[PDB]
Amino acid sequence: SLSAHEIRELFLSFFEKKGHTRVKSAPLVPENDPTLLFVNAGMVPFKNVFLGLEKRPYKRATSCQKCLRVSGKHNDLEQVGYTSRHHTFFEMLGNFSFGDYFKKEAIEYAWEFVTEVLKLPKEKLYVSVYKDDEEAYRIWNEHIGIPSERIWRLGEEDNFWQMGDVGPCGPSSEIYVDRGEEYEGDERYLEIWNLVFMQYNRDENGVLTPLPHPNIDTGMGLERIASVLQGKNSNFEIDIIFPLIQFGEEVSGKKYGEKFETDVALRVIADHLRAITFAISDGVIPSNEGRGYVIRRILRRAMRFGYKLGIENPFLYKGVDLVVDIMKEPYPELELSREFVKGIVKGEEKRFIKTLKAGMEYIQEVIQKALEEGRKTLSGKEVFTAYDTYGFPVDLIDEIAREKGLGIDLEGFQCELEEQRERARKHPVYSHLKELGKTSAFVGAAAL
Ligand SMILES: Nc1ncnc2c1ncn2[C@@H]1O[C@H](COP(=O)(O)OP(=O)(O)OP(=O)(O)O)[C@@H](O)[C@H]1O
Numbered sequence: 001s002l003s004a005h006e007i008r009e010l011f012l013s014f015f016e017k018k019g020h021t022r023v024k025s026a027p028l029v030p031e032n033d034p035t036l037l038f039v040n041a042g043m044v045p046f047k048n049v050f051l052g053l054e055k056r057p058y059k060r061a062t063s064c065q066k067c068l069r070v071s072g073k074h075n076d077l078e079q080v081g082y083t084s085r086h087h088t089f090f091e092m093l094g095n096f097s098f099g100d101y102f103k104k105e106a107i108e109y110a111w112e113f114v115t116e117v118l119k120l121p122k123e124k125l126y127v128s129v130y131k132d133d134e135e136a137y138r139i140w141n142e143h144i145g146i147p148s149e150r151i152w153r154l155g156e157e158d159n160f161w162q163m164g165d166v167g168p169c170g171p172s173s174e175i176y177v178d179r180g181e182e183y184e185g186d187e188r189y190l191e192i193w194n195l196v197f198m199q200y201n202r203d204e205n206g207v208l209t210p211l212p213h214p215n216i217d218t219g220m221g222l223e224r225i226a227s228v229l230q231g232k233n234s235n236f237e238i239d240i241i242f243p244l245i246q247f248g249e250e251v252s253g254k255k256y257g258e259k260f261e262t263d264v265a266l267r268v269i270a271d272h273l274r275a276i277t278f279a280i281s282d283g284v285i286p287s288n289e290g291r292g293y294v295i296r297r298i299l300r301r302a303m304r305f306g307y308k309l310g311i312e313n314p315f316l317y318k319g320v321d322l323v324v325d326i327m328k329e330p331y332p333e334l335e336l337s338r339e340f341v342k343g344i345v346k347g348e349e350k351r352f353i354k355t356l357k358a359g360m361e362y363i364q365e366v367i368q369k370a371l372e373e374g375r376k377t378l379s380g381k382e383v384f385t386a387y388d389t390y391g392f393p394v395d396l397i398d399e400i401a402r403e404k405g406l407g408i409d410l411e412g413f414q415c416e417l418e419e420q421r422e423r424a425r426k427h428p429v430y431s432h433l434k435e436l437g438k439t440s441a442f443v444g445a446a447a448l
């Protein structure tokens with residue numbers, strides 16, 4: 001069945017055998033790249049290798065990179081807690097080939113692990129390849145010997161990965177595990193591995209030119225595949241995250257399997273706990289802008305659902321220990337940051353807790369008040385009060401109102417923001433005008 005810490009260890013040890021020097025996951029905080037707030041894949045730290053800038057001693061490298069999908073174009077923070085497959089923090093596993101082997105090797109080493117290493121029968125496996133990429137279809141169907149009906153040839157939106165507007169990109173291939181007949185869609189056909197084939201380098205005009213030395217990039221979700229092997233139907237039910245859920249059950253008294261708006265918060269605490277744990281360990285302090293404000297948002301949204309559960313006291317600080325204990329094997333580093341990070345998560349809570357509550361009474365007050373006078377949204381002078389007078393993240397104010405079906409007049413919040421940038425300026429983060437709303441959801445009032 002393999003445990004979480006067993007699958008990760010089987011992955012890295014397996015490819016090491018395939019000539020892949022095991023590398024240590026870089027910190028969630030990008031070293032020399034101010035734009036990319038948080039890492040998001042195993043090829044992030046090696047982005048300068050595929051480019052040809054760096055020349056690591058090894059032509060091959062495997063790693064379990066710590067990822068955080070809460071910024072830029074890959075922002076999942078919204079669906080976190082609403083589904084069973086979306087996390088902020090998550091462990092990505094993968095192999096990378098720096099102009100070494102290619103598709104014929106990337107697949108072989110990818111099929112042996114899934115069948116000869118994960119003990120998943122080859123009768124329920126499924127794969128995908130870029131239709132116009134007969135190169136991969138041959139290896140799969142002909143070489144490896146897989147039936148055609150079990151292979152899908154999709155378009156660009158499904159089988160063509162790119163490293164931005166310009167740079168190395170190319171066709172891809174995904175490995176899907178069939179979960180029976182009781183399920184439907186991407187569930188029954190859970191994506192478990194993403195094999196990316198850097199073949200072409202898109203120029204500034206959108207034209208694709210081949211590379212003289214192709215590359216390989218793979219990203220298998222640890223928690224996601226762990227679900228399969230652990231016969232679970234939720235990434236939140238794995239040996240490493242469930243204890244965190246029950247931790248919520250115990251802090252509130254509530255249990256799993258009853259209401260929808262309850263299982264959510266439970267997943268919210270457990271997930272966000274992982275986020276705010278490794279984050280602070282990798283050098284992030286709750287501030288009012290950029291990275292430092294992403295942790296604060298994640299830590300404040302946990303604070304909210306916790307309060308929605310009835311937990312009227314700082315609790316996440318107790319959850320930091322559980323994480324270190326569950327994650328001290330692959331990342332012993334956390335132990336040293338345990339007490340450290342424990343003081344931080346406890347420091348933030350006792351700071352905003354009193355405000356977080358007062359605010360919940362304010363916001364909810366203008367909710368029923370609004371829907372009575374027939375308003376379908378919250379006024380700009382209302383979401384702002386909660387943003388300033390209460391330090392509530394603008395995204396949170398939105399989620400708190402979205403419950404009753406109410407929205408928030410964007411333009412109002414827009415004008416209201418100008419009514420303060422002109423007021424404060426008449427009677428760090430710099431933001432344009434009319435572009436205030438494209439930054440007000442990522443920076444606090446005190447920093448905006
Ligand atoms: N938030 C997440 N929580 C859990 N697993 C994830 C998450 N994001 C990605 N994964 C897993 O990591 C694998 C590699 O990431 P990839 O970039 O292919 O994801 P994706 O294209 O966003 O697909 P998906 O829609 O299933 O998240 C995915 O196939 C999936 O198994």
Ligand SMILES: [Mg+2]
């Ligand atoms: Mg996705």
Ligand SMILES: [Mg+2]
Binds near residue numbers: 158191
């Ligand atoms: Mg996909």
Ligand SMILES: [Mg+2]
Binds near residue numbers: 174194
């Ligand atoms: Mg994918």
